[PDB]
Amino acid sequence: AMDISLTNLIELVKKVNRNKVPTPMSAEEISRLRVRKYRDPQNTETTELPESLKALLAYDRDLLSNYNMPVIETLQKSIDNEGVIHSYSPDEEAYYGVGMDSSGIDIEDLMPVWSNDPRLPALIRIDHVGDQAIFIYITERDANGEYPIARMERNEFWLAESSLVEYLYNIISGAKDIGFTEEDLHLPQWKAQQKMNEQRDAALLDLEDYHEAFWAKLDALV
Length: 222
Known about the structure:
The protein has helices spanning 6-16, 27-32, 51-59, 91-97, 164-172, 188-205, 212-220; strands at residues 34-36, 46-47, 84-85, 122-126, 133-138, 149-153, 156-159. By secondary structure, it is of the alpha+beta class. It has one domain (1-222): SMI1/KNR4-like. Helix 1 runs parallel beside helix 5 (164-172). It is classed as structural genomics, unknown function.
């Protein structure tokens, strides 16, 4: 019986927002936005933003969760003049994941760190409340206009929440006056979409790993 619409989500986001200077993007600005379809920077094909991201930008581009931490800050660094969100690539997260941040070797010398297979979908980075990396996985939108969420922790990368909507409901659940807890968020429609997403995107997820050439360079080090 729980109501998990985008409209409801934004009311809850308005409710917890710790940002004292809300800065909505206008409708016009939001309308121009597109996102690159593929991870490959030379591939200029674009596709639609998910509905959740457009609704968040329309409310406050600088919102801070109940954790007093941002959600959609980093992704704004990827927006060009034409309004295209260029793909993020998880090489820094991958590099830190195998502890190479303490190697004294500049990441640039070991690029590509992560796979650069030409099939890989675009990523939008989401700012997270813990150590993990969170991404919107730009494959195909679902019936609600959402893309899946992917997570990365140390060397592991996987499809996780059904969408940014599910991710945010979970973030917001810890607030006491919010009307629900994490125990209310085991919704069959979310599990069903996650199952669909995994079937649909399995061949792409199978490509998400460290580059062979990265292992080769590490093996060659003295």
